[model samples]
Target: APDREKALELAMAQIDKNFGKGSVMRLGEEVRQPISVIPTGSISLDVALGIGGLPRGRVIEIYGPESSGKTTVALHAVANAQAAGGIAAFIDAEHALDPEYAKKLGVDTDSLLVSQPDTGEQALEIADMLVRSGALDIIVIDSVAALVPRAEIEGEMGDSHVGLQARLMSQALRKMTGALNNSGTTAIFINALRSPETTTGGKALKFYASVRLDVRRIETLKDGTDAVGNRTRVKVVKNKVSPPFKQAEFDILYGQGISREGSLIDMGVEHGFIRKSGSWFTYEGEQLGQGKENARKFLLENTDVANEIEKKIKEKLGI
Candidate 1:
């Protein structure tokens, strides 16, 4: 009884009624809204990402070599999320969540929901629950390499069914991304660098991830005979929320987390709040220190002045 054009509109309207509103729509009628973001806790990294930080309601993949600061960056985002009164959770698939270490990094361990699952299926279900509830602000899955399918656990040693884990990951991510589209939670999947210049979790990760970052250590920071931290470089290889291929560099102190003071000093110097002449650094026309380390120490000791400059810089950044 209906004409062709009217029949198409009727079908689309039926879809919306069947699965919530806005589930089906014609192209060109949708509005492009500005995405909300959570800061990554590094000034340089935030500046590198034109969106100020990780875009909410999207999947982000961070992969890098061992000790390259991938987890540190994710944990920093968790801390930032909690600081803004948003809830966060971590799935420690590798069972390597050190409470003391995360606390040092400013994550509220008491408030943070952490899980250690026996099988990859269980982990995926838990993620599904949290994501569909739409109560959480962000979720971090430690590493894709660690997720093991039940088949692998039930079988004998080294008697494996190829691609089982990959298949499970693909299925889980497919569902997760659907729920992610309706929620504001940002899902961060930490992946390990594999051989042949690829990351674990098969090709599904490369396809589903809205943003993919690669991190590597550039230089090691040492104190006398002891290694203190590493200066790392983060490259945004793929980004759907902003322009891609932008990179940032920062320091990861051993006991301390991301050296915010160090990043702040660097940002201050760039914005002219902290002036650097040769090896000396000055602030407000007064000599703050002579070296980079000393200048960062000066800012750390003088919290009031540093806070003011940090605020102005954040305002300048529009974060």
Candidate 2:
């Protein structure tokens, strides 16, 4: 019992000293395989994961509150995975997943599988089955907090099953490794609600995460009642492939999709990629327009300026 906290301290000490995590610029000659890294479609976050993007063949935890853009971030990765010739699935245990919205975010709905499992066990079963199918490269569980225990769903939340939820998830992950010899089914993005997202799972599912992220904050986009979409802060709580505690900021236009506002706009202001004077935007000393919004618009329209802005963001991010 006394060794519990001691173990925690010891575990993090390796990360603090950059001695553990197995991240290598070059692997040993005996190693035959290397993990794959896929883009999340956000250059800012693509840099934060340390492996370039979402690490394939690994479990990733993305948790946050409602409207915190948890689903948005997951969809971005799904879209990117699909573009890279990978199939994805959305297991909506809570039945709140929006297919059209996901499609708008660039998800290939025609190829992506969508299912609504009635219980947590069923959801995991479906995910494990998909993992075995090997066609489903990425699987997203929208809001683990909503996973209804099988007993509860079947009207038998008896003591026998009172706390086996985490074990089920942890086992499901174990099954993934056992299901195949060599698999590229990377990116199992499990989304969670705020409450459960903040704690270690009762079943120790958090322990199985290769990377754990939190949607820390969603900056208000509206005034009093406008309801416009806001920006979000994604913080890495635990990372085995890269440095933890790394963070990135991005914005989502109401009803549109997530974009790199920090990389494209905020950091641009800081780096002077685009000149700003009295709400006026200039490129290469030539006046483009007035207002910050205009500045972003100018960058979006001018490929050279937009490229410069993106390059600066990635460079500053140390990617």
Per-candidate clashes come to 0, 3
Root-mean-square deviation of each candidate, in angstroms? 7.1, 6.6
Assess the local accuracy of residue 109 in candidate 2 as a C-alpha lDDT between 0 and 100.
83
1-319, model 2: which lDDT tens digit per residue? Answer: 6697687666666654785344432222122233576676666676566667877777778877677777887888888888888888888766776778888999888887878888877887887788777786677877676666677778877665565666666676677655522456764545555434333242455776777877756576553456556778888777766656677777677777775543577666666776678767665666766655555556667777667767766676554
lDDT values, one for every candidate: 0.81, 0.68
Tens digits of per-residue lDDT, candidate 1, 31-91, equal 2334688888788887676677898878888888888999888988999889988899888
Candidate 1 worst ten-residue window by lDDT: 25-34
| Root mean square deviation (Cα) for candidate 2 | 6.6
Instruction: Report the number of the highest-TM-score candidate.
Output: 1
Name the best candidate (by lDDT): 1
Per-residue error for 87 in candidate 1, Å, reads 2.3
Candidate 1 segments whose C-alpha is farther than 4 A from its true place: 1-34, 156-160, 195-199, 222-227
